[PDB]
Amino acid sequence: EFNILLATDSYKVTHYKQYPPNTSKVYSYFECREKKKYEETVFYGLQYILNKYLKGKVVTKEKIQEAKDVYKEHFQDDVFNEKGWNYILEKYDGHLPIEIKAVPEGFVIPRGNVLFTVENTDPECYWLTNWIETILVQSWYPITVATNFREQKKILAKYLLETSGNLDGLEYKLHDFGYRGVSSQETAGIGASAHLVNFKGTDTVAGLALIKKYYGTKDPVPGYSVPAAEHSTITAWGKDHEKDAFEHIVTQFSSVPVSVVSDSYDIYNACEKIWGEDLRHLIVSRSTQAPLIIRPDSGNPLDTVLKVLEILGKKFPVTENSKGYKLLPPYLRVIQGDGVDINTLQEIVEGMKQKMWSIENIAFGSKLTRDLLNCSFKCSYVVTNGLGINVFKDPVADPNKRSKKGRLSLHRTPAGNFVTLEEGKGDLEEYGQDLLHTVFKNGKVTKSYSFDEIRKNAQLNIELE
Amino acid sequence: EFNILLATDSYKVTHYKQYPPNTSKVYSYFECREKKYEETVFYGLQYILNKYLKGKVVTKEKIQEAKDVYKEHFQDDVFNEKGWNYILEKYDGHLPIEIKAVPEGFVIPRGNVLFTVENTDPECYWLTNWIETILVQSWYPITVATNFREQKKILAKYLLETSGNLDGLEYKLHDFGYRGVSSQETAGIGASAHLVNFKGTDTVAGLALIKKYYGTKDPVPGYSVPAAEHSTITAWGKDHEKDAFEHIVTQFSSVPVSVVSDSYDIYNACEKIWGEDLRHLIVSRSTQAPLIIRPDSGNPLDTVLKVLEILGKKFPVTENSKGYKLLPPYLRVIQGDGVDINTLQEIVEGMKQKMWSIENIAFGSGQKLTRDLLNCSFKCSYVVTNGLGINVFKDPVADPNKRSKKGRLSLHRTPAGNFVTLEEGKGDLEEYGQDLLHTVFKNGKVTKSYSFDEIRKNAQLNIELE
Ligand SMILES: O=C(NCc1ccc(S(=O)(=O)c2cccc(C(F)(F)F)c2)cc1)c1cnc2n[nH]cc2c1
Ligand SMILES: O=C(NCc1ccc(S(=O)(=O)c2cccc(C(F)(F)F)c2)cc1)c1cnc2n[nH]cc2c1
């Protein structure tokens, strides 16, 4: 079973002995620190952490003893605030005396703004605020995944709109292929849920169950897939029988969309001779609701996509849409799922546009770090001897690492943007309502968002228009 | 509860229908495909076998669950309910799969077979690649273990050159990465991979994982000591940094303590606060209880060098037998900002050039490694259809680097004592001695395992082996 007493950075076990004596409050905040482009971030994923790890009776006698035993060996010393944890157990039935206030999930907020704050609700637990920094800071991952996919969606939207005149199918243009490529089963679920804030096509099944458990959708599921081959289902037929594999597979899935990886031996031969001649009669007969989706999976991503389109355009009837761009027949599409990151995605759609190919023709299949958006948790306010003091770091050699001072609040500006007020200036009430809401207090999740609301919050402007 | 029927890439749910008719065997393998990082540490499969693959992993409820989910996910009935029911009924939900692997901790050159997977029942030909997704995640502990071993080689080289020995090497790179990984589970797995190489960690999650899945003779595989963070310094107020420092070193007067010193001005903190105002509290400390000063901002190399020069002028420095400068034993430095394998190299070389021993410094690790770094990859190499075995492979025209191995594979020692992978069942010709892979999983049971102590021994540096 998960033990919150064992879910912090080791050194934090020793911090209760280091704060100023007579400190009754430690108040901390999380931001995606501005850096002297990723100018706005999607706040997403805190609700998962709150429910899975922070809520309810998270302290027990057994958990305290377990931690005591582990830390004794780990530190070769008895340092461990057994009394402090006992107090939470006895006084609060093992519920964390913490209040967390956060911007609503799905909100798109410029860099350098307070996203959530954390403080102890009982003076005895001044040490607890930063104990849980480690676990809360891992919110950097769903925030950065949600943000990065939103930025990729902006690129796709721009090019789809320009080449087609509309945004039809946009939410299925970037399919999550990343399950095998992440570091763990837990990460797979979290990352997939963040992808699904932006898109609806996924092969990372783990994301569905996480969304259902922690967030919820009106629809039975938040994400979808369709049949497709992998190299093993093609190569198993033998090198001389690729055509036989293709035929079997498209015939098995004759009435649903089917994607078929076509580069096992020679992608260009597969497109021109196998799909484009030998099996063409099985493709042109397919429904608009059940296209063949050809998947190249190797070579230079841009060069290969363009050459594949060029080949298919000469073997199948191409039309020109009202924007002047070339469009494959509705029973035939292409998906590129090799080497697609935000930079290469841009390169491909731009390259397609230059060659007069509509983005309607293509879909894509998809490391990020905590430093990308400078996700950071810092103490900004403490009360010592009954006096509040505004605290901060400001390293001489790096002004980019300066932190905010005092009690914080987030507000709409008169022009409708965002501003973070420091030093308790929100109390002056010159800027309307604080946009941070209490989401956790004393062991209870106090405000929750559905996955539907989060998706709405995270919409692109071009979608709103 | 984890459900293996829901732990694969969605498209794999449809593959049972796509293999050639009458296929009785699918056989696949994992390698770190050949294209720095010429040898990889094989580590982490044992966790996956025990946590996810062994025992009764199929139940009626899990089958119904997957059926319901996939019906909505695919907007159609495509899920192989019958195939999973067969495993439930015939094998009491244990997977009819055999896995053979190189021993955990082994250091093996790129492009060798590391593990193989095949079905042991003809009805379950589709099962081999169902579990590709789960098994391929072994890329992460392999890559973490490998990258940290490569960092250890750099540290060993420079520590040996500047001090004449390797004392303290296993405490020279401390894991600071708990907050910077993607999940609690990843934290435990990644920390365990770090601990294959080192013994100092702040990622507590790693200890319990090692204890549960691997085991050590010692109570714990990794250690830490007290240290400050910016909040425990800055909480005292901007004008009271000295008061914070004094309190902390006094609270931890008889154990090692690390104090971050860059909250406002690292150079002033070192020269005036530590080096003058509080010097009397430092020079009185035991060799077993040093102050470890931690800069945490600025150019990592430039900052380390300036911090050492400052301390060198305020504290008595000696010259060791190799001619390098050494701080007194009650005083050390740790650099935990911006340290990846490249910057680690730049710092130790920069120190060497300025005649500072590597004894003076430790590093904190806390750059993202991906599955592409070592080209970790799982591919089908052999199938049996209509009773005939066939050697299979991909070989994409535009990328020869993605060509996969053919046929049944085995791992062997060459006459010179190196590794070679034999393809096309050639291992059976008995010209290269015994297959070095061991069966580690068969029919729902883990059949061979390794303690964490043995894994560490397997992963040792040559320089450590002397
Ligand atoms: O092909 C794969 N999965 C199936 C798949 C995914 C995505 C598409 S798609 O063309 O985006 C598409 C088409 C129609 C409906 C949907 C829908 F509405 F359902 F989203 C998605 C079609 C098929 C695949 C391929 N390679 C992989 N490597 N690692 C994981 C992988 C997964
Ligand atoms: O200082 C931190 N943790 C405590 C710590 C770690 C490492 C050292 S060390 O100097 O390598 C050292 C010294 C003596 C014994 C050990 C031993 F034998 F115990 F390993 C380690 C001393 C203290 C720390 C600092 N910043 C962090 N950011 N994110 C996580 C962080 C952890």
Residue numbers in the entry:
A (entry chain A): 8 to 43, 53 to 382, 389 to 487
B (entry chain B): 8 to 42, 53 to 383, 388 to 487
Paper excerpt:
NAMPT functions as a homo-dimeric enzyme that catalyzes the rate limiting step in the primary salvage pathway for NAD synthesis, the transfer of a phosphoribosyl residue from 5-phosphoribosyl-1-pyrophosphate (PRPP) to nicotinamide (NAM) to produce nicotinamide mononucleotide (NMN). Crystal structures of NAMPT in numerous ligand-bound forms have been reported. These structures consistently display a NAMPT homo-dimer with two essentially identical active sites at the dimer interface. Typical NAMPT inhibitors were found to occupy the portion of active site responsible for NAM binding and a tunnel-shaped cavity extending from the NAM binding site. Furthermore, we determine the crystal structures of six NAMPT mutants in the apo form and in complex with various inhibitors and present a definitive model to explain the differential effects of the mutations on various structural classes of NAMPT inhibitors.
The RD cell line with the S165F mutation is almost 1000-fold resistant to GNE-618, but only10-fold and 100-fold resistant to APO866 and GMX1778, respectively, demonstrating that inhibitors from distinct classes are differentially affected. Cell lines harboring S165F, S165Y, or G217A are preferentially resistant to GNE-618 compared to GMX1778 and APO866. The identification of resistance mutations in S165 was surprising because this residue does not lie within the drug-binding pocket. However, the part of NAMPT structure that is responsible for inhibitor binding is not affected by the S165 mutations. However, expression of S165F/Y mutant NAMPT allows cell survival in the presence of GNE-618, implying that the mutant NAMPT retains a level of enzymatic activity to support sufficient NAD production for cell survival. However, expression of S165F or S165Y mutant NAMPT proteins in a naïve cell line resulted in decreased sensitivity to GNE-618, indicating that these mutations are sufficient to cause resistance to this NAMPT inhibitor.
